[PDB]
Ligand binder design. Structure first.
Ligand SMILES: [Ca+2]
Ligand SMILES: [Ca+2]
Ligand SMILES: [Ca+2]
Ligand SMILES: [Ca+2]
Lengths: 548, 548, 49
């Protein structure tokens, strides 16, 4: 079966308009994947330890020590928006749809090829490449998710984003249990804190092998491998944002006095003394009904401690947060808090011809308003008694623990039974699409890395590896290290991801926000005179939705 | 499937005589196509700017600045008469048929081969060619015409014209939007006119990719690709010309006096004073019924401004005209006006052994008489009053704008509701066969480049490309430029174009014009002692037809 | 009766949108004053040939 193709290249997105404003989006994606034989045909338990860094007082957050099992397999990950949609498809979906549903997923591997490299080491000297017609490509599909879930989008290692650029898979590796202790300190700390890696707890040791837990297929040139169709189990993802705050929920106060002339300084007037008003409040001990005092249904968003690192049995880790935000976009300098930052390279959006090893990055700033402005928070004594007196207020300016740069807001947490919150928004093109749910008895209410989380069923990971091409001399009983003919493989990948979307409706008199090409961004969507390209990030929930 | 052919070579033309003088012409054409891997596997946006030329006052017409998207694909175009008929087939069709109908079109790609070049760089040094049995040829057929319509005949880049000479496809590229301004000037102009390229309008930007909009097939040696049959939507094309002018329409004047002796100076005589005649005229204010004054049904042909360049958002362009012409063929020096000029090379008609880079060319001079002789035009004051006086005539000799070399005829336009006109005639072998209609709400009454214009349905373009053959070293994340094994491909193409013709009838006592080989042209249809060949152009509508 | 559009190119296209600049042409003022600003219909290229 050498001279016969086993598949088709398809990278088209189809919209199929059903009934009742629901369309079916079929995203096809094909790619040529390049794969070299493993640097080692063995599994390894490698420890990483950068104590030299953290040894410097004040650097706890630069902790990198961990342990991982390095396997001789590669992972073919296509779980990122950029792998399926191009800028033009995203604009259509994001501008005209109101919500998204993830439906199916299926892959395929065809037109496999295995070449060999011979050192034509003559003068120059040289190199020769030849087909190894009887060689094999090993393929394993972990349908039962026996293996550790390792989504590549987290480290910018998924398949590439351009239909016409060959891509590659990533070396697979997973974490191995270890104990580590790191006591925090600051520049003025004395003596040496405590920074040790304790080793492994035998009761938490799990060494996984693909050979032992997954059936492997050997594909020769004439072979093809096709995953069946996987049908997802999820909630819909919204493509519209909310802008309401507790301050904009409900019936506003009745203005007994309205302006009578156009004018920036012509305001309306409630026209009633603040302690002589009517309405409901939750401050049982005052007569002041204010817009900051009046009672609202519940609470949109919450407060959490910031740049808080917690520690458990294997080192410090940052305390997660859902969303960030602020008022008049002090943007960028605005950033920080809980706005995701993505760093990527030449294959996932960075300008293709860019030299150097510095990645490209961006901080995604969502349209939703469900965050907090710490500088505006404050706490005061129940007696109320305005104007508040210094000993009766704790402002986000007063120090804590004596530290000049720490407030109570840094320690603060206002999550409770009244917290209303939104799931995470899609991030094009670098964001991950779906995630696997934690196998704990009590699960997170949402995942900070993907808008879709398969509870029960999640697609299995696909592993690939070039089978060993040994030379006439091979001795299993020797330390050496098997020597094998330099072999590599190229195969085509093809996936199909199906969504179900709901067409949007116009509910207000005014137009709304839409994604569009303009004089300014115009050149982020076309190649240059050298064929250089780049894929700029874009927002998903542009279009307000009322919350209450 | 390596050692098995997937097709047949056929280059025969069949005439199948149906019923009622209608024959069916089946033209088969096969060719061996040679294709190298792309100079770049990327799409590029390249700008061409030759301001150095146009910077020279008086050279506006030598404007070449434009912008184009250079793709890594090649186009297999067979839309030219020479690709389907040889001189002998053309003579038969042109001499015995009266009209042509375009019916079907279908193509096929078989016996694909992919070789590799190894630098046997030893001493000489050397080169080695080897089959890459598992390599692929990428094929894409744009059935829905998603891509820009780029007919190769316009730049003499279609498949070759000899069944026994290997051919090649042309690198595909299409136009990209841009703004350009060029103010006209002449040799004596002062200062510098204004010649700038403004860039791109974001609202007109369209970057097309074949990968994203067309399904691609990968063919290995054992594979074949076959387009289904396309059935055209068109009007018939005529193979007879008209010779009548307004001056030869209707009942000629009754001669009251006829010659009585053979003799060049023995003329007939209307024998009635010009202002005492009967008939109809459209000059409500005179009694002169002349052959130049008498009323005719409508008007055959029209007048348009000549060597008129107009300008829009992207530079100057020549104002199109339908047909040219003149009386006693002042031929060649006659040319100019609106007679097409074709420049081509070794593969499309130029003498095969000819050295140098100068192309071969010809100006097609049609048999139809629907043009104008400006030198004979003139305008005069309504009062008439003959003999006309200088201040009452504007002759094509009197200057305009003060310019010594410009008449009113240069500015003149007489197109109107009474204009009778003919469609363009076929041009063998360099002319294009069919064209796609403009997607504007109001279409042209005809196209100046092809006798057949599919309104609704037009065949889709066929693109070809050698899939990337990577080496053991490929890094998607690097600026470099992928390095790949030098690969190339050879495949056979086979097309079938079906027409439907109407056999001609003899309507007059005298014989008519027929194409024939003679002592003079005899050697344009046979090879020489070295195997040199050439394909001389020929006319299609030789045989008069009465218009009225 | 309208026909929904399709995306035929890699790049996004021109769309009508509210922005910081035009924002107040679509809402009344403190006196109830209103206005209806003109807008364009054929924003989105189509290939002619
Ligand atoms: Ca233990
Ligand atoms: Ca906001
Ligand atoms: Ca514009
Ligand atoms: Ca004539």
């Amino acid at each position: 079966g050498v001279g016969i193709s086993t598949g088709t290249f398809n990278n088209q997105t189809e919209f199929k308009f059903l009934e009742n404003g629901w369309v079916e989006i079929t995203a096809n994606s094909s790619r040529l994947v390049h794969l070299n034989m493993p640097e080692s045909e063995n599994y390894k338990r490698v420890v990483v330890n950068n104590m030299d860094k953290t040894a410097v007082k004040g650097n706890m957050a630069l902790d990198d020590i961990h342990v991982e099992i390095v396997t001789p397999w590669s992972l073919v990950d296509a779980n990122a928006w950029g792998v399926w949609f191009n800028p033009g498809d995203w604009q259509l979906i994001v501008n005209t749809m109101s919500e998204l549903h993830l439906v199916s997923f299926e892959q395929e591997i065809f037109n496999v090829v295995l070449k060999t490299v011979s050192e034509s080491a003559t003068q120059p000297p040289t190199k020769v490449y030849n087909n190894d017609l009887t060689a094999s490509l090993m393929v394993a599909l972990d349908s039962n998710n026996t293996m550790p879930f390792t989504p590549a989008a987290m480290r910018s290692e998924t398949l590439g984003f351009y239909p016409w650029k060959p891509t590659i898979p990533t070396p697979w590796r997973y974490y191995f249990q270890w104990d580590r202790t790191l006591i925090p300190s600051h520049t003025g700390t004395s003596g040496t804190p405590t920074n040790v890696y304790h080793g492994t707890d035998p009761d938490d040791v799990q060494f996984y092998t693909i050979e032992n837990s997954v059936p492997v297929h050997l594909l020769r040139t004439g072979d093809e491998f096709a995953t069946g169709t996987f049908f997802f189990d999820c909630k819909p993802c919204r493509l519209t944002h909310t802008w309401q705050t507790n301050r904009a929920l409900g019936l506003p106060p009745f203005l007994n006095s309205l302006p009578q002339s156009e004018g920036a300084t012509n305001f309306g007037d409630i026209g009633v003394q603040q302690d002589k008003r009517r309405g409901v409040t939750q401050m049982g001990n005052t007569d002041y009904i204010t817009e900051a005092t009046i009672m609202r249904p519940a609470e949109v968003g919450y407060s959490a401690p910031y740049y808080s690192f917690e520690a458990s049995t294997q080192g410090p880790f940052k305390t997660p947060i859902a969303a960030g935000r602020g008022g008049a976009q002090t943007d960028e300098n605005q950033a920080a808090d809980g706005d995701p930052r993505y760093a990527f390279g030449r294959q996932h959006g960075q300008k293709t011809t860019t030299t150097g090893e510095t990645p490209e990055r961006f901080t995604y700033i969502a349209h939703q308003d469900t965050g907090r402005y710490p500088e505006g928070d404050w706490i005061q004594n129940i007696n109320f008694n305005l104007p508040v007196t210094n000993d009766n207020v704790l402002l986000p300016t007063d120090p804590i623990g004596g530290k000049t740069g720490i407030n109570y807001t840094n320690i603060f947490n206002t999550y409770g039974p009244l917290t209303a919150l939104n799931n995470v928004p899609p991030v094009y093109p670098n964001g991950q699409i779906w995630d696997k749910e934690f196998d704990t008895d009590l699960k997170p209410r949402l995942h900070i890395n993907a808008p879709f989380v398969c509870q029960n069923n999640c697609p299995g990971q696909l592993f690939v590896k070039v089978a060993p091409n040994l030379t006439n001399q091979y001795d299993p009983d020797a330390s050496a290290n098997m020597s094998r003919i330099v072999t590599y493989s190229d195969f085509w990948w093809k996936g199909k991801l199906v969504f179900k979307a709901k067409l949007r409706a116009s509910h207000t008199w005014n137009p709304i926000q839409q994604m569009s090409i303009n004089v300014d961004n115009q050149f982020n969507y076309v190649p240059n005179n050298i064929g250089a390209m780049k894929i700029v990030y874009e927002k998903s929930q542009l279009a307000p939705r009322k919350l209450y």
